[PDB]
């Protein structure tokens, strides 16, 4: 809950947009995943979007799908995800970490029991990819009772009552979609209305891979950009030279974050 308010106040303060990386927890093995996450923070990461690997990624394109399979082959479970989440909170206590989830993994152990384990480990927000606003009530009441921000998606085709509901129930940031589709590295009235309704900071989402999209987003009114596949593609690409991987990752993040001045 608060680490976001913190970040958005200090960012508004030094007048810049936010830069939030995405990585799947455990790809391409736990040991190198933790180092990728430290190098991402090192190079420029304002907050973190993290994935817990699901079997059936309903809203994900192929880079993330293969990432999930690399994780699964490395033997990563939901429990290894929570135990590595506490080790990186143990050394980076400022950074907002948000979890991007699928509903079966939240629901599995008891919904409320999920939120409690998040709280316990140091997690700030939970985005459940497949629970629409009209189904959120069990999930949003249980994250509020455990002081985890409920993140909701605002789609390009959103209407009056939906922007109102997302503004009321959301916290942390409003996940603002770029396009229709599933997560892939390829190809204003809403931001205005969201602010009119007092919806928390619009971070823009699918398909940013280019720095000029970041600048563009911030310039448009988006409090930052989220980039996912773009980053995972460098993990995939450099799986054979870990050194060069961490090195190319660094470079990518600092450039991407540099683009956030506006």
């Amino acid at each position: 809950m608060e680490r976001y308010e913190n970040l958005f106040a200090q960012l508004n303060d030094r007048r810049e947009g936010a830069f939030v990386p995405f990585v799947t927890l455990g790809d391409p093995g736990i040991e190198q995943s933790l180092k990728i996450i430290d190098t991402l923070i090192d190079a420029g990461a304002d907050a973190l979007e993290l994935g817990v690997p699901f079997s059936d990624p309903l809203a994900d394109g192929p880079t993330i799908q293969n990432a999930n399979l690399r994780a699964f082959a490395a033997g990563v479970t939901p429990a290894q995800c929570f135990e590595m989440l506490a080790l990186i909170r143990e050394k980076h206590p400022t950074i907002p970490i948000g979890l991007l989830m699928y509903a079966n993994l939240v629901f599995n152990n008891g919904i409320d029991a999920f939120y409690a384990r998040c709280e316990q480990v140091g997690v700030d927000s939970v985005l459940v990819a497949d629970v629409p606003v009209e189904e959120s009530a069990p999930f949003r009441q249980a994250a509020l009772r455990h002081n985890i921000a409920p993140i909701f998606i605002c789609p390009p085709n959103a209407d009056d009552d939906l922007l109102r509901q997302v503004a009321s129930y959301g916290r942390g940031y409003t996940y603002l979609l770029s396009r229709s589709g599933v997560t892939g590295a390829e190809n204003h009235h809403l931001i205005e209305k969201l602010k009119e309704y007092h919806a928390a900071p619009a971070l823009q989402g699918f398909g940013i891979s280019s720095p000029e999209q970041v600048s563009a987003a911030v310039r448009a009114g988006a409090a930052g950009a989220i980039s996912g596949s773009a980053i995972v593609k460098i993990i995939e690409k450099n799986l054979a030279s870990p050194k060069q991987m961490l090195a190319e990752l660094r470079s990518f993040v600092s450039a991407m974050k540099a683009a956030s001045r506006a």
């Binding site: 059936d56 990624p57 509903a103 079966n104 629409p132 606003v133 009209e134 189904e135 589709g181 599933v182």
Partner: protein, 389 residues
């Protein structure tokens, strides 16, 4: 929403936010269509004059010999296309057109919904893409060639088990991206509301015709109606008009695969736990961690690790009973229908049949009037059943 999305705790709309207005468009379209007399009229004309309906209710002459069981079959195998599948798809293509849509995405496991999706798109003029798992493409290939000759595109999903789950997934992934132009013609009474209600309503003629037919032949209603259950459409099409006649039991048959005890089966409703996937809250087969499990069946149209929600509800309140049948028991009922009645059934429908034989031969002196929904023909299956030698 104008209609309820829950069958007790089961159901819902567990989709990405972006598809919700689309589901909402469809429910409105459905409610409008159902009252539109002009919709009803041409749904009817194409069911009768094009699909070939009423389907017949056949009495079994030879398989019940030396038993007090009378066994009628409902012949959805005599339906244009070769399966029950065709009744729903005609209503839904008509809904797609009423809503100015022009592409059709669909997913297929036995190939029968794919083929039925290609035949209605060619008739009503809609372009059509179909996802089908790479293992089902091999073990069900007659249905592949049939789709491509009608001009549909089938796309081979190699991910996961390369089976219907994996086709459902790629099908929903594309519709999120295409929902403007494209309708998603869902395979069964499963997934997101309004699809559980639409597929049932567009398949209840099956049981409205059986009830009428049996009453004319027997002057009384059956003792039990039996149907196999992969996602749930033929079963609910059959059960639906019978639900308020408490005297009529309703049995549903799930794939026992290599035997429940091996892990290799497809029996969610009776050997899985409630989960959330493919837009619903329904019994599911999953690991301890909530990762969805790969199922197994000898039959591609039944190889699916969840079950549609209304079945989950009718089980729970105790109005329908669900049972399973092994691969081997379904092969035995196939071989027996062929050789003593001269009807090749689909390996899917053989699971329902094999239970009715088990009911008969376990208590041979029990006087019982049964009805099995023979949902399709075994033409897609003859090459496969014949390499089991």
């Amino acid at each position: 929403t104008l209609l309820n999305p829950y069958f007790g705790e089961f159901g819902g709309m567990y989709v990405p936010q972006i598809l919700m207005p689309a589901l909402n468009q469809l429910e409105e379209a459905f409610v409008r269509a159902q009252k539109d007399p002009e919709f009803q009229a041409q749904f009817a004309d194409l069911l009768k004059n094009y699909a070939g309906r009423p389907t017949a209710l056949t009495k079994c002459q030879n398989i019940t010999a030396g038993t007090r069981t009378t066994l009628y079959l409902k012949r959805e195998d005599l339906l244009h296309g070769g399966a029950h599948t065709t009744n729903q798809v005609l209503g839904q293509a008509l809904l797609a057109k009423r809503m100015g849509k022009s592409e059709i995405i669909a997913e297929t496991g036995a190939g029968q919904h794919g083929v039925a999706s290609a035949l209605a798109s060619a008739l009503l003029g809609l372009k059509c893409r179909i996802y089908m798992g790479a293992k089902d493409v091999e073990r069900q290939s007659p249905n592949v060639f049939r789709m491509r000759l009608m001009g549909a595109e089938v796309i081979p999903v190699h991910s996961g088990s390369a089976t219907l789950k994996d086709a459902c997934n790629e099908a929903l992934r594309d519709w999120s991206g295409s929902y403007e132009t494209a309708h998603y013609m869902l395979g069964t009474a499963a997934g997101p509301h309004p699809y559980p209600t639409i597929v049932r309503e567009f398949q209840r003629m099956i049981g409205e015709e059986t009830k009428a037919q049996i009453l004319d032949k027997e002057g009384r209603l059956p003792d039990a109606v039996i149907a196999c259950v992969g996602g749930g459409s033929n079963a609910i099409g059959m059960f639906a008009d019978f639900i308020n006649d408490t005297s009529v039991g309703l049995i549903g048959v799930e794939p026992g695969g290599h035997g429940i005890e091996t892990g290799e089966h497809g029996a969610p409703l009776k050997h899985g736990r409630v989960g959330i996937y493919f837009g619903m809250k329904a019994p599911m087969m999953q690991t301890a961690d909530g990762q969805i499990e790969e199922s197994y069946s000898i039959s591609a149209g039944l190889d699916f690790p969840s079950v549609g929600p209304q079945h989950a509800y009718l089980n729970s309140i105790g109005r329908a009973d669900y049972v399973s049948i092994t691969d081997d028991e379904a092969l035995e009922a196939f071989k027996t229908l062929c050789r003593h009645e001269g009807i090749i059934p689909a390996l899917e429908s053989s699971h329902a049949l094999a239970h009715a034989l088990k009911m008969m031969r376990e208590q041979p002196e029990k006087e019982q009037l049964l009805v099995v929904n023979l949902s399709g023909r075994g033409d897609k299956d003859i090459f496969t059943v014949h390499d089991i030698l």
